Amino acid sequence: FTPPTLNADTPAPIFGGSTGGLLRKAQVEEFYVITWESPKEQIFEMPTGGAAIMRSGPNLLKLARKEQCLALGARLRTKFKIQYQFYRVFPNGEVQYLHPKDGVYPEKVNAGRTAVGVNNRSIGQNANPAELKFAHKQAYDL
Amino acid sequence: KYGEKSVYFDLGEIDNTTGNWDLYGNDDPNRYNGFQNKFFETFAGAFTKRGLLLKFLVLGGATTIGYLGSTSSGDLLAIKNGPKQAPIMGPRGRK
Amino acid sequence: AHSVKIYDTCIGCTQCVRACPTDVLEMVPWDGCKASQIASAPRTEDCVGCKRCESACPTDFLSVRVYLGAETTRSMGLAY
Amino acid sequence: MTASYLPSIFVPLIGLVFPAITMASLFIYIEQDE
Amino acid sequence: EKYQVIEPLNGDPFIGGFETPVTSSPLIAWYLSNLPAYRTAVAPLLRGVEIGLAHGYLLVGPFVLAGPLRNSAVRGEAGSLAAAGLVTILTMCLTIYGIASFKEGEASKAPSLTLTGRQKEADKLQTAEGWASFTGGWFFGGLSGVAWAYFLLYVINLPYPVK
Amino acid sequence: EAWGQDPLHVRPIAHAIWDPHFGQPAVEAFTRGGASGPVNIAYSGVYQWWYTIGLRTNQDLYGGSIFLLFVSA
Amino acid sequence: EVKIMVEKDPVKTSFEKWAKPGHFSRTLAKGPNTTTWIWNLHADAHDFDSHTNDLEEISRKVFSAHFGQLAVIFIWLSGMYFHGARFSNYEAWLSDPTHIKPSAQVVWPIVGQKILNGDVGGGFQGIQITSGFFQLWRASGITSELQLYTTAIGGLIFAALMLFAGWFHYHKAAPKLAWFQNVESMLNHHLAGLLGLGSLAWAGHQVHVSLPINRLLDAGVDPKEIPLPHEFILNRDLLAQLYPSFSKGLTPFFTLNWSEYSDFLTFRGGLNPVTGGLWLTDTAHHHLAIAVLFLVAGHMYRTNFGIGHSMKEILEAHKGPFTGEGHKGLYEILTTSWHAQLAINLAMLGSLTIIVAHHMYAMPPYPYLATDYATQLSLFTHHMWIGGFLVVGAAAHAAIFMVRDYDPTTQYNNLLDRVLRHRDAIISHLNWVCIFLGFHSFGLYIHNDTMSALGRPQDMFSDTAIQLQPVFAQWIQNTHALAPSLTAPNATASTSLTWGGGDLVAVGGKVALLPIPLGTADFLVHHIHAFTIHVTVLILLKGVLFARSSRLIPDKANLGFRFPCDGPGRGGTCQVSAWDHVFLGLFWMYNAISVVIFHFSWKMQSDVWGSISDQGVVTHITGGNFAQSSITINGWLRDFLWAQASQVIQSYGSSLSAYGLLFLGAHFVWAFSLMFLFSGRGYWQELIESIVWAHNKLKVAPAIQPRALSIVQGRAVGVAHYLLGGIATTWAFFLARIISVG
Amino acid sequence: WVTFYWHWKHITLWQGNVAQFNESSTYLMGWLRDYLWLNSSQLINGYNPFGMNSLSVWAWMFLFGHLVWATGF
Numbered sequence A: 001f002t003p004p005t006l007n008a009d010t011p012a013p014i015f016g017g018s019t020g021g022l023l024r025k026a027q028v029e030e031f032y033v034i035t036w037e038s039p040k041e042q043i044f045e046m047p048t049g050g051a052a053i054m055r056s057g058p059n060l061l062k063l064a065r066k067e068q069c070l071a072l073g074a075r076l077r078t079k080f081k082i083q084y085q086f087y088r089v090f091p092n093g094e095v096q097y098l099h100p101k102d103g104v105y106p107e108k109v110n111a112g113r114t115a116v117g118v119n120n121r122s123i124g125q126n127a128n129p130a131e132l133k134f135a136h137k138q139a140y141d142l
Numbered sequence B: 001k002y003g004e005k006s007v008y009f010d011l012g013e014i015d016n017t018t019g020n021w022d023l024y025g026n027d028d029p030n031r032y033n034g035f036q037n038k039f040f041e042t043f044a045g046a047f048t049k050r051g052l053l054l055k056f057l058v059l060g061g062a063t064t065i066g067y068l069g070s071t072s073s074g075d076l077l078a079i080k081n082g083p084k085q086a087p088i089m090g091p092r093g094r095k
Numbered sequence C: 001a002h003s004v005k006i007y008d009t010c011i012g013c014t015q016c017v018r019a020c021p022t023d024v025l026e027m028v029p030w031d032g033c034k035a036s037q038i039a040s041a042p043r044t045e046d047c048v049g050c051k052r053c054e055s056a057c058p059t060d061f062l063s064v065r066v067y068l069g070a071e072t073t074r075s076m077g078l079a080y
Numbered sequence D: 001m002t003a004s005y006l007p008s009i010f011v012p013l014i015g016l017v018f019p020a021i022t023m024a025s026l027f028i029y030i031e032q033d034e
Numbered sequence E: 001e002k003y004q005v006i007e008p009l010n011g012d013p014f015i016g017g018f019e020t021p022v023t024s025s026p027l028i029a030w031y032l033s034n035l036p037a038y039r040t041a042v043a044p045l046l047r048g049v050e051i052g053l054a055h056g057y058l059l060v061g062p063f064v065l066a067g068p069l070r071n072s073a074v075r076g077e078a079g080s081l082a083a084a085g086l087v088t089i090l091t092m093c094l095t096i097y098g099i100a101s102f103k104e105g106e107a108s109k110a111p112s113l114t115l116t117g118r119q120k121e122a123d124k125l126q127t128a129e130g131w132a133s134f135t136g137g138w139f140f141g142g143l144s145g146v147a148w149a150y151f152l153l154y155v156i157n158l159p160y161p162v163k
Numbered sequence F: 001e002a003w004g005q006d007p008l009h010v011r012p013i014a015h016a017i018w019d020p021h022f023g024q025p026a027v028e029a030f031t032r033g034g035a036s037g038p039v040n041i042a043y044s045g046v047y048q049w050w051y052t053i054g055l056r057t058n059q060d061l062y063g064g065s066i067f068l069l070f071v072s073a
Numbered sequence G: 001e002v003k004i005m006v007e008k009d010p011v012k013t014s015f016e017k018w019a020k021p022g023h024f025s026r027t028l029a030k031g032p033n034t035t036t037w038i039w040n041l042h043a044d045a046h047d048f049d050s051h052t053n054d055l056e057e058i059s060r061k062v063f064s065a066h067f068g069q070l071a072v073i074f075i076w077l078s079g080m081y082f083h084g085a086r087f088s089n090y091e092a093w094l095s096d097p098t099h100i101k102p103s104a105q106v107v108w109p110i111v112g113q114k115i116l117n118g119d120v121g122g123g124f125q126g127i128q129i130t131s132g133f134f135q136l137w138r139a140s141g142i143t144s145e146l147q148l149y150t151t152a153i154g155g156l157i158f159a160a161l162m163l164f165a166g167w168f169h170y171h172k173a174a175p176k177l178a179w180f181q182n183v184e185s186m187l188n189h190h191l192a193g194l195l196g197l198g199s200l201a202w203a204g205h206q207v208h209v210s211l212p213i214n215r216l217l218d219a220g221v222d223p224k225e226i227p228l229p230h231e232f233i234l235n236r237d238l239l240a241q242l243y244p245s246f247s248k249g250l251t252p253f254f255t256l257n258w259s260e261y262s263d264f265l266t267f268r269g270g271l272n273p274v275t276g277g278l279w280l281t282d283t284a285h286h287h288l289a290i291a292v293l294f295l296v297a298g299h300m301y302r303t304n305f306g307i308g309h310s311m312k313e314i315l316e317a318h319k320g321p322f323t324g325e326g327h328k329g330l331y332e333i334l335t336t337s338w339h340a341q342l343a344i345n346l347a348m349l350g351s352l353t354i355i356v357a358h359h360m361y362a363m364p365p366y367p368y369l370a371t372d373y374a375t376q377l378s379l380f381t382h383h384m385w386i387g388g389f390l391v392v393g394a395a396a397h398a399a400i401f402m403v404r405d406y407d408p409t410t411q412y413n414n415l416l417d418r419v420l421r422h423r424d425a426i427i428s429h430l431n432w433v434c435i436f437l438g439f440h441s442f443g444l445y446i447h448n449d450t451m452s453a454l455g456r457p458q459d460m461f462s463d464t465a466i467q468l469q470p471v472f473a474q475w476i477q478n479t480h481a482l483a484p485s486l487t488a489p490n491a492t493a494s495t496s497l498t499w500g501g502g503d504l505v506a507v508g509g510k511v512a513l514l515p516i517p518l519g520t521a522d523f524l525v526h527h528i529h530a531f532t533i534h535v536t537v538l539i540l541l542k543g544v545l546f547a548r549s550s551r552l553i554p555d556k557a558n559l560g561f562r563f564p565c566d567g568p569g570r571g572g573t574c575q576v577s578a579w580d581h582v583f584l585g586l587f588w589m590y591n592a593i594s595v596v597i598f599h600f601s602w603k604m605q606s607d608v609w610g611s612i613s614d615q616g617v618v619t620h621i622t623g624g625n626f627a628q629s630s631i632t633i634n635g636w637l638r639d640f641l642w643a644q645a646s647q648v649i650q651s652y653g654s655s656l657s658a659y660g661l662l663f664l665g666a667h668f669v670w671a672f673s674l675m676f677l678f679s680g681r682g683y684w685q686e687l688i689e690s691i692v693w694a695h696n697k698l699k700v701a702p703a704i705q706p707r708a709l710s711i712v713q714g715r716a717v718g719v720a721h722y723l724l725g726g727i728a729t730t731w732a733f734f735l736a737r738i739i740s741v742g
Numbered sequence H: 001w002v003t004f005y006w007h008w009k010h011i012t013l014w015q016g017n018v019a020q021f022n023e024s025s026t027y028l029m030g031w032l033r034d035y036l037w038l039n040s041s042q043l044i045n046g047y048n049p050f051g052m053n054s055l056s057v058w059a060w061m062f063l064f065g066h067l068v069w070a071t072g073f
């Protein structure tokens, strides 16, 4: 799966402005950009507070947090049945593809995915903190 | 382009994209005419930061307040005026 | 950020992945349950610590465990 | 009191100057990036 | 399809702000653009001098008419010294703020883009030496303004309604 | 010393007060224990304790304070 | 088209669902796995929106529940009238109202509680009542207990009638949704037919019953030989000798020679010197005028005869450049959401109750009401608390609407959307004004405390120090005192004795009302009131505006309205739900109303209430120390809380001992609330686990598993007990103090 | 509770009227009135509109502690 590139010619939804939007964090640290395809002009609710009309086609919306991107994407998926994907954008122009890392949503199991953080024992079989005294590691890290 | 269409995201213009604008930052350089005196008289503060200005401020606040508290007269400051009436004396005859 | 761990008691119901608001968990192939899948947390650096994944796990005690810590920028959920 | 001026000296220092220096130094220290 | 006075910040609906008459009226915007804090091309020292002059001059009054010695014959001197002490404390505040915020040798991070998009030069006030010069000018101007207010009020004794 | 000469009718003094915020009524209200200015009346029992263990004069207490400074050093 | 629409027999009248507790909801209808179920059964019983999504069924439930509430209120009123008929000294109080304490409750002699039957006067022993019912019945022209009995029987009949009406309109003929959505017809009927006709009817009563009986009472006639109201209606010559204009007999009304009715339709103002209440001629003219006004106003909206206003078209036509579509889409909001209507009506009812509290003491509408200081204080405090609770409830239901009933699709660029879109600016500025008010009021109090403690009384904020005179309120009082001279020339007296003029009404040997002076203390206390109100508004408005989403949790609408938190992430999301904002706004409303009632009590006991002697010397209950003691927090602690609480704590062994008992018990309940407020839930769950082990060791563990209260339930219990304890402490304290000193 | 008991017992012992404690300590209204309300009269009069005395500092600290308690709330 080849990640898509972030096009800079994608029109944004019709929005009248809000006090909940990009702030100094967006210009010093990072922000996010969500893109989705819509079949018709319909009203959705902005995750930052308000309402907007999505374009009849490609859309491009700037967010300040990843959680807002997931909220808008979940509403789009379960309400408008719209596929979406977002990116993390840095002040230096670096764009990172985020949500469908392999093109398939995380709810569906996909081959080629590595098991990270999986422990091969029961949760109650953890080592006691006393045995790991003065060792710079945690019981769950074993 | 940022303003060519309804697009508001552009990697070539990240300051416009992120809203890093200066709303009232006028850059007109002609404000004052006679300012040689102000440059001349201000050498202890400018381009000193932690070395000269801070030490001078600490010394001139400590010495200033010490002098004021040590040389204040009775009328201006009541704590240094001292008691004037007789002791009120406490209960059970304890003094 | 926070530390998220998955245990072999997982049954591959995917309910922890759907409850995650920052897309930290994902389902990977596995052979220890009927569902032939197990949860995993490859991108915990985005975890905020809500433990909504913990509330959605149906096992007696949780197959997914969030331990908190660090409290970085993404962890604190700050937009400024 | 042997030295009545000595309270009038010390109380202002430990009351205003010592806190000023202490808080300035601690603010400079806790805002270092290193 | 009406007039719709209110507009988003620079036309961007996804920036956290608005265009209101309070924000960007021609008169309000002209007033704010010519304040010494927003004259980026002018040296920080002179802007600091102006700011300190104004602030000490306005600060002298409250201390004089509300201080503990406002009923005494040293009311003016006490108020002026209180204003000068507040100016000195704020000078220490500015110095420590500059020490913590700015590091020597770094470029200014102030916004260098106008609303139109002229891409002017960055303001030098947001630099270590710029802030040091600003603090020195503010100290000098604050002391000067306190002295001027004391002279006008008491040494010269101009007729004023309340004092 | 005054307390020791007459314990049942002398109030112990903790330390002097130098509050620039006091008014004259506050200056004269807190002048107790035969002091020349505002003082605090001790309620820690140090006067009784030091009188019991043999300390009698202010020089004894000063010597004890210097000795304890040396001990802390 | 406005028409009557009902459904026949929608719900069968059966006890089958009575045996099933949680029938109304799918979750609770299964059964009690845990003890939480029981609490949930009582927390979702009246949440009709949660039972089903059908708006018709919700509307029917709401209508029938309103009928049930009306029946309950009728039972309560019938009980009050019954207790006035039998267990009261109402007639003795009629004979001598200035020296007999009203009483309508008599205790049984069981455990020594018979001491509570105090000597109220008139050969009667009982609890001294402070509800003002005696004065209300005196105003209504009631002279015998037989009339109270017949009123109580009618009240029972009306309660049964309302109960039957609720049953009929739920189970037999239930209106359809179109019937409920006829808001124009409802407004026309409730303005012309409910308020206008009710005011007209009460004006008729006053003209024909209250005025003659009350003027005979003011003349000193013994109530026994005062002719009955029907003798005034029938023998109109008997009514005309009191007011000659009745001899004209409706001719002036129809010839438009209305000035001939000036005998009993006056615009005097002020107070009746004999009774200390408002003139009932002024009240009759008032009620007639407002009846005419409401009957005119109720002909404004178009139902089905043309001629009128469509509220939808009125709203859609009001928009401007600073707003978007303006009032577009609000008609659907207010005709399809019950919670929005409840929020508006609760806010208006609370503000209206506060207006009532402020206006009933400045113009006592009932005879011998002002001189009954206990009744005045009780009425003010009661209605203040009712109003505050209603306002907080309005905030709660606005939040509920925003969470559940809000539809973004039909609300675009209108007023609600735009308010949602600059909530950050609103809350920022409201926070700033709250901080500024808190500083420049309470810091002024702290400044006064410090300068008083430092021996610098000249540096304080008082009348003998730096003065903060309320010049605007003083100017308003001056303007209102001179209103009859130039601005309302057809007025005899000003609106109230509180404005000014040097007039003092003194029924018996007490003081009814006098010009209330405003100084630095009043400036300070009003700014304290403003601070508290703005902080309460901040909490509630921040809860409402951020109910759907915020920068912390962008999907707070999915979480719901009543949820504990979202987790310990993002630094901790404790109390992010709008329910928690209401939970804190309850505390802040408590503080606001408490300070308001304390200010009222101290100001009245200090500057208004008192006794006047034969010479003309007026002494006050406290002694006019509000101007110099209310400026200091120590003054509040000592001259008000410590000095005026001497009677509640010394009430033991007397008829007021119940007030001391409840004073201490309310203290207890408040302290008890503190642990539900301070503690968590895991601790109690683990303690319950240990107790369950103890029970299991003896095979006595229940199958319904004991669980600790939920987090939201813990907060609800804490706030409920907190408010109950505080309000009951004040209730006991005021009642004991004002019964002792009056 | 411990210090309240100690203090009231010793106030009524030192004043010589122990009957007040013996009669009033059996019910909580006695604790509120004869100990808390009764013994706070001189405390709250430390400073008043008519002047101030040496107990003004303790009145100010009393109110200060009340304020810090509420901020903890």
Ligand code: CLA
Pocket: D006, D007, D008, D010, D011, D014, F015, F016, F017, F018
């Ligand atoms: C911990 C012990 C202690 C404490 C609480 C105080 C408290 C006080 N002193 Mg005293 N003092 C002390 C020891 C102490 N003193 C000793 C050992 C000396 C001998 C040098 C003095 C000599 C002294 C003078 C000459 C005067 C005071 C005065 C005062 C008052 C104003 C504060 C001030 O100016 O300090 C000044 C204090 C010093 C110069 C002594 C140095 C500081 C000592 C050694 C303690 C420092 C360490 C201590 C553990 C604190 C740790 C900080 C924190 C972690 C708690 C205040 C009541 C003034 C007064 O009477 O006003 C009415 C005044 O004029 N002090």
Ligand code: CLA
Pocket: B057, B058, B060, B061, B062, B064, B065, B068, D011, D012, D015, D016, D017, D020, E067, E068, E069, E077, E078, E081, E082, E083, E084, E085, E086, E088, E089, F020, F021
């Ligand atoms: C415990 C330490 C302490 C001490 C020693 C003082 C001392 C003083 N305070 Mg108080 N104050 C304190 C803590 C303290 N304050 C705290 C914590 C607060 C906050 C609650 C206040 C709030 C407060 C107020 C609100 C006021 C005072 C005022 C005063 C002054 C009394 C009036 C006077 O001197 O005549 C009149 C004053 C003068 C003749 C000279 C004052 C100006 C001199 C020059 C100040 C020294 C400035 C110097 C350059 C910098 C030194 C400090 C720096 C190193 C940080 C006096 C200097 C009064 C005053 O006059 O304020 C200025 C006043 O109105 N104080």
Ligand code: CLA
Pocket: G011, G012, G013, G014, G015, G017, G018, G019, G024, G060, G061, G062, G064, G065, G067, G068, G072, G163, G164, G165, G166, G167, G170, G171
């Ligand atoms: C005897 C006549 C009768 C009978 C058999 C029924 C039977 C039924 N009704 Mg109907 N109903 C009646 C009279 C009757 N109702 C009347 C008179 C009214 C008008 C108020 C209603 C209004 C009504 C509504 C609005 C609804 C029902 C519903 C129901 C069903 C379930 C009710 C249930 O189990 O809750 C039993 C509940 C109770 C016994 C609680 C009684 C609470 C009373 C009303 C208030 C008492 C307040 C009290 C004085 C103060 C308490 C505090 C104090 C102790 C300090 C069932 C078919 C519900 C339904 O169909 O479900 C979908 C429904 O929504 N009824």
Ligand code: CLA
Pocket: G077, G131, G132, G133, G135, G136, G349, G352, G353, G356, G366, G379, G382, G383, G386
């Ligand atoms: C828990 C609810 C509650 C309770 C227990 C009480 C209890 C009491 N109220 Mg209060 N009150 C409340 C809520 C409550 N009130 C609210 C919400 C309002 C605002 C509408 C009022 C307004 C109010 C007034 C104005 C008066 C009382 C009075 C009384 C006393 C009853 C005497 C009586 O029967 O006269 C019943 C009341 C009257 C005969 C006069 C009422 C006149 C009003 C204007 C008519 C109501 C119009 C309309 C139906 C209300 C909705 C208006 C809205 C659509 C705009 C008693 C102390 C009376 C009092 O203190 O007597 C000493 C009194 O004069 N109350």
Ligand code: CLA
Pocket: G062, G063, G066, G067, G070, G179, G180, G182, G183, G185, G186, G189, G190, G192, G193, G194
């Ligand atoms: C002149 C006509 C009229 C009058 C007087 C009223 C009066 C009232 N309505 Mg309204 N209503 C009307 C027309 C009218 N309505 C129309 C046309 C509609 C349909 C659009 C509605 C729809 C409506 C709803 C949806 C609700 C009300 C409610 C109420 C009551 C509110 C409680 C209150 O403050 O009452 C103070 C006065 C009293 C308590 C006096 C007792 C009631 C007497 C008997 C008057 C009843 C008038 C009645 C409408 C006549 C028809 C009944 C008849 C067949 C026997 C009040 C009794 C609310 C309520 O509480 O429901 C019970 C409520 O929820 N009404």
Ligand code: CLA
Pocket: G042, G043, G044, G045, G046, G047, G048, G342, G346, G389, G390, G391, G392, G393, G394, G396, G397, G400, G561, G562, G579, G582, G720, G724
């Ligand atoms: C016209 C008035 C009115 C009406 C019709 C409603 C109607 C409703 N409210 Mg609203 N509300 C009101 C006023 C009103 N409220 C006011 C004044 C407040 C401020 C306190 C609130 C605050 C509020 C909140 C915060 C919530 C509601 C909820 C609800 C729903 C009830 C569900 C429930 O659990 O109730 C069942 C009934 C109870 C839980 C009451 C139990 C008894 C209470 C808690 C204590 C009684 C105190 C008592 C006087 C103490 C002394 C006696 C004692 C010694 C025995 C329903 C839509 C809930 C809702 O819709 O959730 C989605 C909800 O969360 N309301």
Ligand code: CLA
Pocket: G431, G432, G434, G435, G436, G437, G438, G439, G442, G443, G444, G446, G535, G538, G539, G584, G587, G588, H067, H070, H071, H073
């Ligand atoms: C006495 C107890 C107390 C005090 C003082 C406060 C103080 C405050 N609360 Mg809190 N609160 C309390 C109890 C208290 N609360 C309790 C019990 C609850 C539970 C219901 C709450 C719930 C609560 C909420 C939910 C909210 C507040 C808010 C506020 C603020 C009001 C506005 C403001 O900041 O300016 C006024 C500030 C004060 C009056 C604090 C005292 C300042 C004095 C006057 C000056 C002292 C300074 C002096 C110079 C000394 C300097 C010290 C220096 C030497 C170190 C303020 C921080 C609101 C807020 O955020 O602000 C808008 C808010 O939303 N509080």
